[PDB]
Write a protein that binds this ligand. Structure first.
Ligand SMILES: N[C@@H](Cc1cc(I)c(Oc2cc(I)c(O)c(I)c2)c(I)c1)C(=O)O
Ligand SMILES: N[C@@H](Cc1cc(I)c(Oc2cc(I)c(O)c(I)c2)c(I)c1)C(=O)O
Ligand SMILES: N[C@@H](Cc1cc(I)c(Oc2cc(I)c(O)c(I)c2)c(I)c1)C(=O)O
Ligand SMILES: N[C@@H](Cc1cc(I)c(Oc2cc(I)c(O)c(I)c2)c(I)c1)C(=O)O
Length: 575
């Protein structure tokens, strides 16, 4: 009856406050921290009165009306430059649609640099409650599409490392190796969910369902099609709600789905035994990455049910959604060595062929050779991941990253330098992640990872579009994004970039760089070099790059660093 009371009773006061805090920080990523907590406390205050009596006033209002009204009380900024939506001047459901609108994927915010080790322990034992909420606020506003129930699981692992290393002799040896892991998997998890949200909002519900049908069929190849279909239906509702700002409903229905899977293991998978004995947050996280089950032994051939049968065109006419879903389910459950986007490519080819052949004379003869068309679609990814692992093994991660950085800069040189650097580094991480697997698990690992990193490129670029060819590859076909970018060649409509020199101004931090920060500086410099001389050969690029690095060398060792960079730098500009 009263929706705010229902969610308060299902989740408990702990997770209720955390989810509402995450919700407000993703809609207003600019807002001060202490200003958010004040709004979260008035929520919890009013929800308790509705639990006491559901006919108390305003208790019959929707969550969108309650959350939307609180956010509209304070959130003023400054200059608009004549262009800025007024979500608070709109009614529901238009107002919420205006909030999801203003989610910023790349916002200016001070780069969180850890204070020293001994003061975080002072701040944990400060106001513990206030310390944990700063962890959620600071990451939610930087990742406004972060999977909400999974962020609660990281807040618990974050609290566990503080209650185990602050009470030790040596702290930094206990902590820091546990904080850097939490922010690595934290950033893997964020980009993963961004691809799901991007699918739902930009390609529709039917595209996401087909994606989850293929993936759950690989994980649970012994389950019946009716069992896979119910799982997909529940899973789509969950991600639709998280991706639309209904975080209370999203967490609630996710606990329901885990409870359903654990009490039906004997018709789903035999690998859910250990995950189902874990506590709640641990549980859904364990199911999220359980491994593939054993494939059934003597499954019948695919060509019997989809090529040779006389009822092919009949079944496709009388029930196309069930028939085409059946094709995808049967093909994926026996090809765990295929990537998801490859499997979706095959089903797309199968449906196009049927629409043509079933409208002609003798359809049985028309589509009889449809597996011939799958052969080229399968070999292209296999050979591509073949050569990158060879290059990775030979070069190493940093040199592998630089090789990908150069050719992507040559494909889309209009893309900004910060975006090109971060994307190229993430592309190069696939070698470390996948090339160590046998030559069978590689493509499931690799191609589905590249889809995540390329989606990052798409959403970073659409905010400020500059490259016509990026816009093309991003908006045409979701499942064809990776073959789209790989087929791009060097762009010759691009005019060489002017030299600027402001990129190389001296800073006191360049002579005490960590190994990681040193690589980022050189990659940035390499991008700007390719943009300025797009026809420079790769032998000429090394000579110029080696010369500049040696210039940075000695000057970091001179009597006056800042005079060396100014004096010697002027000679290089006028050379
Ligand atoms: N490569 C894919 C693999 C994968 C996707 C989904 I979709 C899924 O089904 C669930 C069930 C629950 I419960 C969840 O909380 C989530 I998230 C997904 C499962 I199992 C595995 C990925 O990126 O996940
Ligand atoms: N010596 C190799 C040449 C080669 C260079 C690169 I750099 C490379 O890495 C990528 C990664 C992605 I992702 C792409 O879309 C593309 I195009 C290339 C690969 I694999 C091969 C040969 O002779 O085959
Ligand atoms: N302007 C920045 C600092 C900055 C100075 C330099 I000098 C520089 O150029 C190189 C080139 C190579 I090649 C290197 O290996 C290295 I280390 C630095 C870069 I990129 C950045 C700021 O104000 O914060
Ligand atoms: N002297 C030229 C201008 C010019 C200055 C530099 I300094 C330079 O060397 C680099 C090295 C790296 I590494 C870069 O990322 C870049 I951009 C330029 C080059 I080639 C040309 C003129 O008179 O027009």
């Amino acid at each position: 009856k009263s929706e705010v009371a229902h969610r308060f009773k299902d989740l408990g006061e702990e997770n209720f406050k955390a989810l509402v805090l995450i919700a407000f920080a993703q809609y207003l990523q600019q807002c001060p921290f202490e200003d958010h907590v004040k709004l979260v406390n008035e929520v919890t205050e009013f929800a308790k009165t509705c639990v006491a009596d559901e006919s108390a006033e305003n208790c019959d209002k929707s969550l969108h009306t309650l959350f939307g009204d609180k956010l509209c009380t304070v959130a003023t900024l400054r200059e608009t430059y004549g262009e800025m939506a007024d979500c608070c001047a709109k009614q529901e459901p238009e107002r919420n649609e205006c909030f999801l609108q203003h989610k910023d994927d790349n916002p200016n915010l001070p780069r969180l640099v850890r204070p020293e080790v001994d003061v975080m322990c002072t701040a944990f034992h400060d106001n513990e409650e206030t310390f944990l909420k700063k962890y959620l606020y600071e990451i939610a506003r930087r990742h406004p599409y972060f999977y909400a129930p999974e962020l609660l699981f990281f807040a618990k692992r974050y609290k566990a490392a503080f209650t185990e290393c602050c009470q030790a002799a040596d702290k930094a040896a206990c902590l820091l190796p546990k904080l850097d892991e939490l922010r690595d998997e934290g950033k893997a998890s964020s980009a993963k969910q961004r691809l799901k949200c991007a699918s739902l909002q930009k390609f529709g519900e039917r595209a996401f369902k087909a994606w989850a049908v293929a993936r759950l069929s690989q994980r649970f190849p012994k389950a019946e099609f009716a069992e896979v279909s119910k799982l997909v239906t529940d899973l789509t509702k969950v991600h639709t709600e998280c991706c639309h700002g209904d975080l209370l409903e999203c967490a609630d229905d996710r606990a329901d789905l885990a409870k359903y899977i654990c009490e039906n293991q004997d018709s789903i998978s035999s690998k859910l035994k250990e995950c189902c004995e874990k506590p709640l947050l641990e549980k859904s996280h364990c199911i999220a990455e359980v491994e593939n089950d054993e494939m059934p032994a003597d499954l019948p051939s695919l060509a019997a049910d989809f090529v040779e049968s006389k009822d092919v065109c009949k079944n496709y006419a009388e029930a196309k959604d069930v028939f085409l879903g059946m094709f995808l389910y049967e093909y994926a459950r026996r090809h765990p060595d295929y990537s998801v986007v490859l499997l979706l490519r095959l089903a797309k080819t199968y449906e196009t062929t049927l629409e043509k052949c079933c409208a002609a004379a003798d359809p049985h003869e028309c589509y009889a050779k449809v597996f011939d068309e799958f052969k080229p679609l399968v070999e292209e990814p296999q050979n591509l991941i073949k050569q990158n692992c060879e290059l990775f093994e030979q070069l190493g991660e940093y040199k592998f990253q630089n090789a990908l950085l150069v050719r992507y800069t040559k494909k889309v040189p209009q893309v900004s330098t910060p975006t090109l650097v971060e994307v190229s580094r993430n592309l190069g991480k696939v070698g470390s992640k996948c090339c160590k697997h046998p030559e069978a698990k590689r493509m499931p690992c690799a191609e589905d990872y590249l889809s995540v990193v390329l989606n990052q490129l798409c959403v970073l670029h659409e905010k400020t579009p500059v490259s016509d060819r990026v816009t093309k590859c991003c908006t045409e076909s979701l499942v064809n994004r990776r073959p789209c970018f790989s087929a791009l060649e060097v762009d010759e409509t691009y005019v060489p970039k002017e030299f600027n020199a402001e990129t190389f101004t001296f800073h006191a931090d360049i002579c005490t760089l960590s190994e990681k920060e040193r690589q980022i500086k050189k990659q940035t410099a390499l991008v700007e070099l390719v943009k300025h001389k797009p026809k420079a050969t790769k032998e000429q690029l090394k000579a110029v790059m080696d010369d500049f690095a040696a210039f940075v060398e000695k000057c970091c060792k001179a009597d006056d660093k800042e005079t060396c960079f100014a004096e010697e730098g002027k000679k290089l500009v006028a050379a």
